[PDB]
């Protein structure tokens, strides 16, 4: 939930 996932 901290939302650190990479987006492209």
């Amino acid at each position: 939930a901290v939302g650190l996932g990479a987006v492209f």
Partner: antibody
């Protein structure tokens, strides 16, 4: 292959300063969030700092125990992550790992870990 | 801060046995709970993310479950190469925190 290679560890006196580096390869560096996590002599894992990736907002995050003492930064052109540590404490003694996070909504986990560099802080 | 309590702290099992490792959170953390194995002289390695999601390259004998506060890592037919320290870790809120680890040792 995802490669994360830390350097800079050493013996420092308390109150001193030291900068760690982590050189990365094998992935598109700037998109990813990166962290430092340390492992204490008691084998506890403790998160130290995070810097968000380019589509994540780029901000930095720290636990209270290092706020005002440590600074995480990145040089995307060099594929390098840094940890500038100041006002070091004996409790900072640990193996420091660089870690890369995952992708998308289910991607805040640590996905890859480095090999570690050792910091010993002692008078 | 979220406290993760791992049980048992240490467990000895014979290769081929199956185990269930427990991780209990002090407050609800949805499914934001990940598992790592650290073998001796090595860095941690992701086994399972977001309670139950599988990781390419990790054997099918590792399985995770749980949501809210109570999480389980199953290892079904533990192999010699699986012994080591198992940590859980949450990403529901800052600071990011880890459990203290379960040490899985080989019974002979």
């Amino acid at each position: 292959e995802v490669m994360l290679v830390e350097s800079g560890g050493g013996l420092v006196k308390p109150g001193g300063s030291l900068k760690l580096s982590c050189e990365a390869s094998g992935f598109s560096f700037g998109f990813y969030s990166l962290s430092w996590v340390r492992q204490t002599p008691e084998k506890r894992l403790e998160w130290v700092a995070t810097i968000a990736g380019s589509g994540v907002g780029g901000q930095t995050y720290y636990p209270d125990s290092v706020k005002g003492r440590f600074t995480i930064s990145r040089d995307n052109a060099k594929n390098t992550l840094y940890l500038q540590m100041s006002s070091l404490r004996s409790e900072d003694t640990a193996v420091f790992y660089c870690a890369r996070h995952g992708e998308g909504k289910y991607g805040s986990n640590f996905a890859y870990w480095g090999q570690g560099t050792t910091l010993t802080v002692s008078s | 801060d979220v406290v993760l309590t791992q049980s048992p702290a240490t467990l000895s099992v014979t290769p081929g046995d199956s185990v269930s490792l427990s991780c209990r959170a002090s407050q609800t953390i949805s499914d934001n709970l990940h598992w790592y194995l650290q073998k001796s002289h090595e860095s941690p390695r992701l086994l399972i993310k977001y309670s139950s999601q599988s990781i390419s390259g990790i054997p099918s004998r590792f399985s995770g479950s749980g949501s809210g506060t109570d999480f389980t890592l199953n290892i079904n037919s533990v192999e010699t190469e699986d012994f080591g320290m198992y940590f859980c870790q949450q990403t529901n809120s800052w600071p990011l925190t880890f459990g203290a680890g379960t040490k899985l040792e080989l019974k002979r």
